[PDB]
Design a protein around this ligand. Structure first.
Ligand SMILES: CNc1cc(-c2ccc3cc(C#N)cnn23)ncc1C(=O)NC[C@@H](F)C(C)(C)O
Length: 293
């Protein structure tokens, strides 16, 4: 179970929600469409505090439903490859979620070496891939579709254990795929059918395939000042025999052998089937990654 903080704790331990980035003396550690994440301290524990906010176009009602989803999901799902929700504040007109602080931040930022952190070794990238898959597997076995799988939502503890975060968009799975009029996610990560409003766990797999390409290449999922602009189009250029995965391997690594890299790439490529029904389910992905080390 959880703890019910009021603001005055959360406000006051985040330097009154100091929105300046950590690196310039504030408390901001990251931000997304649904809020800003702040560094705080509760008792003797460093925490991450997410204060919700419509950073994109969405309703207060939608924010509140997302807040309630996250609690509901976290109340049911405890696992070492998921983040740990300590508690929340609903006090007044501002919603906060409090988590155990993750000392290595997001996988997106570590693949970028943001703030000067050292590149991830191939050995740690394999541990991260296996961990994220274990976490997704746990969600699907508990009949939850994540719907927002991306490197920004994979956090890393001091041993680089991968932790899936951000469950406000999650949905129960079951019978047959369902459709919604509200299309959510980050387009560079999204499966075809999810772009069309279909809700299905197969879309989590596709998104995980993109994360695996990020892990192998260190490239961003989308980059305007790059060609191609979309990472997932790398599969088409390798499949057309123009290039090979080795042309794209991240150079900021000295411990990556061709055989394990091709094994990871092969998994990513299966995940990235445009046809939803040709993709491996998460159990299969998990086993493929286990066989790879
Ligand atoms: C995005 N960044 C963080 C996020 C989090 C964190 C922990 C749990 C949760 C849950 C959600 C949600 N929903 C969002 N975040 N979250 N914990 C730390 C960081 C961070 O920036 N750590 C510092 C390092 F990066 C380093 C020193 C190398 O700079």
């Amino acid at each position: 179970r959880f703890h019910s903080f009021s603001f005055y704790e959360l406000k006051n331990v985040t330097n009154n929600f100091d929105e300046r980035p950590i690196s310039v003396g504030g408390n901001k550690m990251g931000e997304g469409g649904f809020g800003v994440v702040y560094k705080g301290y509760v008792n003797n524990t460093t925490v991450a505090v997410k204060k919700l906010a419509a950073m994109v176009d969405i309703t207060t009602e939608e924010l509140k439903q997302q807040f309630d989803q996250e609690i509901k999901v976290m109340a049911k799902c405890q696992h070492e490859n998921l983040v740990e929700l300590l508690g929340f504040s609903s006090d007044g007109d501002d919603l906060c979620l409090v988590y155990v602080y993750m000392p290595n931040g997001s996988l997106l930022d570590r693949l970028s070496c943001l703030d000067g952190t050292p590149p991830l070794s191939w050995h740690m990238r394999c541990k991260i891939a296996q961990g994220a898959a274990n976490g997704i597997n746990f969600l699907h076995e508990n009949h939850h579709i994540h719907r927002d799988i991306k490197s920004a939502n994979i956090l890393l503890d001091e041993a680089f254990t991968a932790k899936i975060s951000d469950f406000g968009l999650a949905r129960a799975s079951e019978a047959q795929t369902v459709m919604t009029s509200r299309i959510v996610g980050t387009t560079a990560y999204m499966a075809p059918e999810a772009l069309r409003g279909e809700i299905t766990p197969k879309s989590d797999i596709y998104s995980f395939g993109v994360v695996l390409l990020e892990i192998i290449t260190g490239l961003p999922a989308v980059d305007e000042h790059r060609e191609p602009q979309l990472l997932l189009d790398i599969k088409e250029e390798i499949e057309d025999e123009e290039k090979t995965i080795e042309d794209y391997i991240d150079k900021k690594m000295n411990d990556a052998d061709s055989t394990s890299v091709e094994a990871m790439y092969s998994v990513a490529s299966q995940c990235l089937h445009e046809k939803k029904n040709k993709r491996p389910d998460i159990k299969k992905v998990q086993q493929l990654l286990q066989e790879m080390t």
